[PDB]
């Protein structure tokens, strides 16, 4: 279970993907279904603290983090309260670049 040998062949790992214009569409203060249709199905969803919906990314190599981008979002009583993460800004200049 040790001593990985020099195999220059690995599977292509993905973390997650999200479309930047949806980030541009992110307005605070609407319900779960509203943001659902705005974005789509989150890849994961807990239950005990189920306002944490975030996506990710990784072009990993043998399991090591290579790139990443995150945007957690919070909710109360079925409405958007806030969101934060590292992907919003880069999505912003990406949107400005292609538009």
């Amino acid at each position: 279970r040790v001593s990985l040998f020099p195999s220059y062949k690995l599977k292509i790992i993905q973390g997650n993907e999200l479309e930047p214009r949806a980030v541009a569409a992110l307005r605070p203060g609407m319900t779960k279904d509203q943001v659902l249709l705005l974005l789509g199905s989150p890849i994961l969803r807990d239950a005990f603290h189920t306002d944490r919906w975030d996506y990710t990314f990784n072009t990993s190599r043998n399991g090591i983090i290579k790139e990443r981008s995150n945007l957690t979002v919070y909710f109360e009583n079925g409405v958007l309260v806030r969101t934060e993460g590292d992907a919003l800004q880069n999505a912003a200049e990406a949107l400005r670049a292609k538009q």
Binding site: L4, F5, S7, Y8, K9, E19, L36, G40, S41, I43
Partner: protein, 771 residues
């Protein structure tokens, strides 16, 4: 109103009225006038219970007279002439007709109608369909269909209208149906089927579509019979579009992450040829697989023509809708019995929650099919109530028998019989852990072997295995004997194997062996020098032994359909499997292959064979062993003369003629392969010719021999049998077939430039393959 009190259902035969009351939607003490009458009558009409049941109100004891529905206890079949008894039996029992099963007349009627329609669908119309009913015991009944088929249904005349664009002769040549003829008498090639008719219809319409005529408006078809409803005639009229030119097809829509520039790059359409229907289909396939390679299985393209006559061009605007980026929610696996689950999970991509792309999905298809553990596998996509972005991708498996014994015999032309043994095993009833026994034996050789391996030692997976061998060679045989001696090779080895990419995968292996080379009574100088240089002699004989530190390096890839039916693609690879340095006899030998296939016709095709390699070594030993020499000339070399018959035929004791050959391997194959279309499309018969190029050299010229020169000129150089890039002209036929019981060898050889020092063999035959 009346209340139910122990309904006295009478007139029953074997209805066990207890289960009747259980089947009754009402029980004792239930108030009833008319509500349940229809419900009960339809309930008993269902499940084939009865046919006439009456209910009345009479002091709680209602006389429910019932007549048992007939039940076919025993069924019989006859009239099966075109089809066998088993076929008709299964296709009838597919619609009920089991033991008893509460036979109904309406079931009879629907069944007979369906079968009649099935038969008339083929080329059978004047058919006598007369089933017979025999009343067996109280409930049992028998039926037997009687089918008296007509003579046949033959298509006499084929004719068309609007045939001003192409000659009916050429078009009828193009269409894949026959008419009356002498060579068509075989296999009833003039019969008719609706399905095959339609197939030829779309074929020819597409043919016209490629011919530049737009939309090829088919007007109508008609079939007309003859006397006795025996012979038929077909007439279809159509309307062509005329010649045109397409050079400005355009695309539109949204791309999201997709680059429109890449879209323009992939657009392979030009004004040349003015059109191609299948090119258009192919570009649609390319764009669609791209549109979903990003993870959009439901992005849809819309086509629409924009006509413009005079200039005779109709523009095509292709409007794409992307939407609803899709991931995968869960993977289910079917056909998992007798095997593990991760084992098939080892190979595919898209572990979960991944952008659904067919791009790597077909790669997974290929990856699992080359495993060969199942004949059929299907990949199934289904969403759930939580529809968006998540869909199940459960896949299919078809478990196939693999654990058996490899007891297979064959026959070879020279030695004779040969046998093979050992349990065939690749899967210890679960994960792969492929290990098996394989051995062969003949009057000239024997070799036992056990294999053991895991294809995946690591997460990506490395194939590690042990493998043993005990092969011994006994060239001494009957009159058709090559140089007589023995070979003693045995031992084990370890094989490691890693892929470097999806299409490239190498494998190495290091081990050590031992050999005891042995000689006989006086042998040519090529033996005396060898034995006196390393070996030891006793009397008129002698032998030698040595260590065999060997290394092996290899790589390969396949690109053809093959499966005993070669198709587009070829084999690529390189190998080096000899005793490498670290011990005596510092040697190196390469390997190559090319199996180019050209399926440019329906039956005729050609394959190009490719090989390059030098067996020469280096180091302390500057020579080449006799036993490491090539067996130039013969089947595996050129399929030409008898095996191992290239090079100088040396005189010796008794003045025989045995050659050596060189250590140069290079070959060029070109044969016109094709099946026989007389019988059917069975994967059973081929046919070709034999025309090969083979080069082999040693470098050393041979001039001194056993008091006699076997060459025309005293100064005959033995480096090459002829001029540079040596070869002998020869070409013959090759009757191929595929499988009487499997393996074969059959071919007719005709040489050219018959030298006074070479021997030929026009025909050769082998059975049960070799090795």
């Amino acid at each position: 109103d009346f209340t139910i009190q122990d309904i006295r259902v009478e007139g029953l035969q074997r209805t066990e009225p207890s289960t009747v009351f259980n089947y009754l939607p009402v029980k004792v003490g239930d108030t009833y006038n008319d509500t349940h009458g229809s419900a009960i009558i339809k309930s008993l009409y269902a499940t084939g219970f009865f046919d006439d049941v009456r209910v009345e109100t009479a002091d709680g004891q209602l006389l429910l007279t019932v007549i048992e529905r007939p039940t076919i206890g025993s069924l019989n079949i006859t009239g099966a002439k075109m089809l066998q008894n088993d076929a008709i039996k299964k296709n009838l029992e597919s619609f009920g007709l089991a033991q008893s099963q509460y036979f109904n007349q309406a079931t009879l009627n629907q069944a007979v109608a369906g079968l009649k329609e099935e038969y008339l669908g083929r080329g059978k119309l004047n058919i006598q369909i007369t089933p017979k009913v025999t009343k067996l015991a109280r409930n049992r009944v028998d039926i037997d269909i009687t089918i008296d088929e007509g003579k046949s249904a033959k298509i006499t005349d084929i004719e068309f209208e609007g045939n001003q664009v192409y000659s009916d002769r050429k078009l009828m040549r193009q269409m894949s149906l026959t008419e009356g003829g002498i060579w068509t008498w075989l296999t009833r090639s003039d019969r008719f089927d609706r399905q095959k008719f339609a197939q030829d219809m779309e074929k020819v319409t597409d043919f016209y579509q490629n011919n530049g005529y737009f939309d090829f408006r088919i007007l109508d078809t008609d079939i007309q019979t003859n006397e006795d409803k025996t012979r038929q005639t077909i007439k279809i009229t159509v309307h062509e579009g005329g010649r045109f030119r397409w050079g400005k097809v355009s695309i539109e829509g949204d791309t999201n992450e997709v680059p429109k520039a890449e879209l323009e790059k992939l657009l392979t359409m030009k004004p040349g040829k003015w059109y191609e229907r299948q090119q258009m289909t192919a570009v649609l396939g390319e764009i669609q697989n791209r549109m979903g390679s990003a993870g959009y299985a439901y992005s849809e393209i819309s086509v629409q023509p924009l006509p413009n006559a005079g200039t005779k061009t109709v523009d095509f605007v292709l409007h794409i809708e992307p939407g609803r980026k899709i991931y995968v929610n869960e993977i289910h696996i079917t056909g998992n019995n007798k095997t593990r689950d991760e084992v098939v999970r080892r190979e595919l991509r898209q572990m979960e929650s991944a952008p659904y792309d067919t791009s790597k999905l077909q790669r997974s298809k290929e990856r699992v099919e080359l495993l060969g553990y199942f004949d059929n596998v299907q990949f199934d996509a289904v969403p759930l109530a939580g529809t968006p972005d998540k869909v199940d991708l459960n896949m299919s498996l078809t478990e196939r028998s693999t654990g058996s014994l490899d007891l297979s015999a064959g026959w070879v032309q020279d030695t004779g019989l040969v046998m093979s043994a050992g349990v065939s095993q690749d899967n210890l009833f679960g994960t792969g852990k492929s290990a098996a026994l394989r051995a062969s034996r003949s009057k000239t050789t024997l070799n036992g072997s056990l294999s053991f391996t895991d294809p995946y030692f690591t997460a990506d997976g490395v194939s590690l295995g042990y493998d043993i061998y005990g092969k011994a060679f006994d060239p001494r045989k009957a009159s058709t004997s090559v140089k007589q001696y023995k070979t003693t090779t045995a031992g084990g080895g370890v094989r490691m194997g890693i892929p470097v990419t999806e299409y490239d995968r190498v494998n190495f292996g290091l081990a050590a062996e031992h050999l005891t080379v042995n000689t006989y009574n006086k042998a040519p100088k090529r033996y005396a020098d060898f034995i006196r240089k390393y070996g030891k002699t006793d009397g008129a004989d002698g032998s030698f032994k040595g260590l065999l530190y060997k290394g092996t390096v290899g790589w390969g890839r396949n690109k053809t359909d093959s499966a005993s039916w070669p198709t587009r693609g070829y084999l690529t690879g390189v190998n080096a499997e000899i005793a490498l340095p670290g011990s005596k006899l510092q040697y190196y030998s390469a390997t190559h292959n090319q199996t180019w296939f050209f399926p440019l016709s329906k039956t005729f095709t050609l394959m190009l064979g490719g090989e390059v390699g030098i067996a020469g070594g280096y180091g302390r030993t500057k020579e080449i062993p006799f036993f490491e020499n090539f067996y130039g000339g013969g089947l595996g070399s050129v399929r030409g003369y008898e095996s191992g018959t290239l090079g100088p035929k040396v005189y010796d004791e008794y003045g025989e003629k045995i050659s050596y050959g060189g250590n140069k391997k290079a070959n060029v194959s070109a044969e016109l392969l094709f099946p026989m279309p007389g019988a059917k499309d069975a994967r059973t018969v081929r046919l070709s010719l034999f025309a090969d190029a083979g080069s082999v050299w040693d470098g050393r010229t041979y001039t001194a021999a056993e008091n006699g020169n076997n060459k025309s000129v005293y100064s005959e150089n033995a480096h090459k049998s002829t001029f540079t890039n040596e070869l002998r002209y020869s070409a013959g036929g090759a009757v191929t077939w595929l499988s009487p019981l499997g393996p074969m060898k059959f071919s007719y050889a005709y040489p050219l430039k018959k030298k006074p020092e070479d021997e030929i063999q026009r025909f050769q035959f082998q059975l049960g393959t070799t090795f």
